[PDB]
């Protein structure tokens, strides 16, 4: 929210952004039931809702096919992909031997119960048990003697009410071959994401932030298919865990440094251009700039791609050939005119005799710029016009 100009290196630093760092994963195990429609009074009489049960049967068939084909590829964010391997590994342990049998026994009366694992990692298990409450209790005697769909008019519509979830989730799993990079509203719904995150191994600090940004919590969580066991669907979903909630963080945006006299445009050029954050008194650097997303003030980051840089690297802001920490900066004359879109302003460097000036879109081209790097903010100007490539500036103020 507060940017300063580093005229020594033609760089800007913005220092008003807190951060939230992801640390772990909170596994949840889902157990949905499809009822008893595998073989229940089909016969051969065409009807309207009979064409809805065969859809459920085909959903079961495709859910079995995709589950069988899931264990065929296992023949021995990019930085977040290291977590996909862990999610695959944890699913393999649960799906084998009789761990599911113990899991199923754990929820034989209660829809929610925390269950352990063979490796001791705590895992949460949930069961909906809603479809069986209608297909077995409110549908069994209605369809009798194969005389289908005639002695009712309201329950015909209500059958599609308790059918959307299974169809949607089986379509998703068949399309994505088991791995779902997004937690859709079909797999997990509301009252199962404020309840299945409030049992995470963290403190009261980050849980409130997760409850407020459940949207991006969904955005960063992925699920996998465990398998089909009898008339039941088994699958699990991974939830991100945020270790810290509020640590100082800042951005660095670089550009060509300067020019030199006697017609020799020879200066330096920084290639730092990232974010920094602190975890345990040791600032960590993300080598890429497309690694974190700003949501107001806070910054959301994952502690699986950042690089820890040794302290005393603090004085990369002062570039006087410092001896303590050699900041990694590329060398080369190679003048390239460019404009760096800084958050609260703009950084401009044009050298090769190209006209550069600012424009507020109402006063016109006023205050023509100079050859050297100058700082233009989004209040003294609104655009930085070069040729016909007018650049806009953000409306956020700080």
């Amino acid at each position, epitope marked *: 929210l507060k*940017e*300063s100009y580093l005229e020594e290196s033609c760089s800007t630093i913005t*220092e008003g952004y807190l951060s939230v760092l992801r640390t772990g994963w909170y596994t949840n195990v889902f157990t949905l039931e499809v009822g008893d429609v595998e073989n229940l009074t089909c016969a051969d009489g065409p009807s309207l809702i009979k064409t809805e049960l065969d859809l459920t049967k085909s959903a079961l068939r495709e859910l079995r096919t995709v589950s069988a084909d899931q264990l065929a590829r296992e023949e021995q964010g990019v930085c977040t992909a290291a977590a996909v391997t862990a999610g695959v590994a944890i699913a393999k342990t649960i799906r084998l031997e009789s761990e599911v049998t113990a899991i199923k026994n754990a929820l034989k009366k209660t829809n929610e119960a925390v269950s352990t694992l063979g490796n001791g990692v705590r895992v949460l298990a949930t069961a909906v048990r809603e479809l069986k409450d209608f297909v077995s209790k409110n549908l069994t005697r209605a369809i009798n003697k194969n005389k289908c769909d005639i002695p009712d008019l309201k329950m015909a519509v209500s059958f599609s009410q308790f059918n959307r979830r299974f169809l949607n989730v089986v379509r998703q799993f068949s399309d994505n071959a088991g791995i779902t990079p997004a937690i859709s509203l079909d797999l997990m719904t509301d009252a199962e994401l404020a309840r299945a995150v409030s049992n995470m191994p963290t403190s009261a600090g980050q849980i409130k932030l997760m409850l407020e940004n459940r949207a991006m919590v969904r955005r960063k969580g992925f699920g996998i298919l465990i398998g089909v066991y009898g008339s039941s669907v088994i699958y699990m979903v991974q939830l991100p865990i945020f270790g810290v909630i509020d640590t100082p963080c800042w951005i660095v945006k670089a550009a060509p440094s300067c020019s030199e006299k006697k017609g020799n445009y020879a200066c330096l050029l920084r290639e730092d251009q990232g974010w920094y954050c602190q975890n345990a008194g040791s600032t960590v650097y993300y080598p890429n700039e497309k690694d974190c997303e700003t949501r107001g003030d806070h910054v959301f980051c994952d502690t699986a791609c950042g690089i820890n840089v040794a302290e005393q690297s*603090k*004085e990369c802001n002062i570039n006087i050939s*410092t*001896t303590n920490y050699p900041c990694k900066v590329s060398t080369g004359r190679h003048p390239i005119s460019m404009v760096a879109l800084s958050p609260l*302003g703009a950084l401009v460097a044009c050298y090769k005799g190209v006209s550069c000036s600012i424009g507020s879109n109402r006063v016109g081209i006023i205050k023509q710029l100079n050859k050297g790097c100058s700082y233009i*903010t989004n*209040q003294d100007a609104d655009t930085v016009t070069i040729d016909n490539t007018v650049y806009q500036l953000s409306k956020v103020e700080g």
Partner: antibody
Amino acid sequence: QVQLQESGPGLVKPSETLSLTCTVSGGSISNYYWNWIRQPPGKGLEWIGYFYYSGSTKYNPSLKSRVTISLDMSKNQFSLKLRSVTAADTAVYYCARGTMRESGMPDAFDIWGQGTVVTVS
Amino acid sequence: SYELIQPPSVSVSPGQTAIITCSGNNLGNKYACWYQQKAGQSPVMIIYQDNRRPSGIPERFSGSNSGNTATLTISGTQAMDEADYYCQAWDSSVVFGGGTKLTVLG
């Protein structure tokens, strides 16, 4: 208590080289900015330059070619040397301690000295 | 270069909240800190980063930063302080304010 003590001459003839020295008791570590602040009569504070623990100098841009700031870490002290001193440079000189890493890195002056008066005649 | 311009005198009745404006050009974009210098003695820091308070300063010493004016607020002023409150905002030159003389009327 990382106290500051500034000492030196007190009377410099014009067109000579004033010298001063601030001695720190409690650690001149590579964690604080060591800067000189002067206040001419009329009570307007002016900043001359700061000294970081490594070679890192940055002076007031109306006062370059005249000010030199060095380090004497062996005795835990740092000095200064003006040049072409004139009657306009009669001021009380302070040596102060600055923290780091909350604004660009440079941040505000945590503790100051006691102030030695320097007169030119 | 740049110059932080602030009023040179502020008269405050005892027990009433005091506000000292420090009008820079592009302020709020950069961090601003304040100082307190009683007569004779060397100055001592009061506020830094516009909201913080380093060590031992009484709670009735707060600041803000909005638009182009950073304001120092003293809630319930007393006769104990009649210092010279300067500003500071690093623009590669450490521009200082012109100084503001609080008068609690003695």
